[PDB]
Design a protein around this ligand. Structure first.
Ligand SMILES: *O[C@H](C)[C@H](NC(C)=O)C(=O)N[C@H](C(=O)N[C@@H](CCCC)CN[C@@H](CCCC)C(=O)N[C@@H](CCC(N)=O)C(=O)N[C@@H](CCCNC(N)=[NH2+])C(N)=O)[C@@H](C)CC
Lengths: 99, 99
């Protein structure tokens, strides 16, 4: 699809068998999801932005379906105010900014 | 152009006669720039990010070039970690997300 930017670019994702809403964020290096269970080992990370840093759990090799398009990569889990799809998965679904 | 997301989508902007680097950010409602001097009166605004909330100065009808495209609109100034171009100006330069 072509997504215009008059409104927040929200899509449905499927992760860990769960449907969620998430923001496509070209300004995010990483993908960050609210508290949920994921399989595998994890390691802590601190990630920052406006307002400072939060602590998250880093899980690797996680599959996500993003608006119907599957991608695999690292997913960070923690107290994010918004579920965010970042560049690590946006690249995999072939997303570009065009103007 | 078509901008891929393997690297941060950094562009050159011009504001106040000065060139700066900024991040094209579909996950940002608004445009937020680091401390600088702008003309006119400002109004208060609170904004949120991944780490919490911050106070910024809101300036309206500011002339700004983004990757060579002219825009005129609202610019927020404050303690953002990085200059970000948000949807308010992405829409003025005709940007879309595509996959
Ligand atoms: O971690 C890497 C190194 C990098 N960090 C830094 C410090 O550069 C990074 O990728 N950080 C990510 C990040 O926070 N990216 C932001 C831009 C770069 C740092 C400033 C953009 N992220 C979005 C995420 C949505 C909120 C969680 C963001 O902050 N959007 C704001 C921008 C401010 C503004 N007014 O536009 C935003 O849109 N805020 C509005 C509210 C959003 C809340 N929505 C709902 N429904 N409640 C607003 N009007 O205030 C992070 C994510 C780590 C990978």
């Amino acid at each position: 699809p072509q997504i215009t930017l008059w409104k927040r670019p929200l899509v449905t994702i499927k992760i860990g068998g769960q449907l969620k809403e998430a923001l496509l964020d070209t300004g995010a290096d990483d993908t960050v999801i609210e508290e949920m269970s994921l399989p595998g080992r994890w390691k802590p990370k601190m990630i920052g932005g406006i307002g400072g840093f939060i602590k998250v759990r880093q899980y690797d090799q996680i599959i996500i379906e993003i608006a119907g398009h599957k991608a695999i990569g690292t997913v960070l889990v923690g107290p994010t105010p918004v579920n965010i799809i970042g560049r690590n998965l946006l690249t995999q679904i072939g997303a570009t900014l065009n103007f």
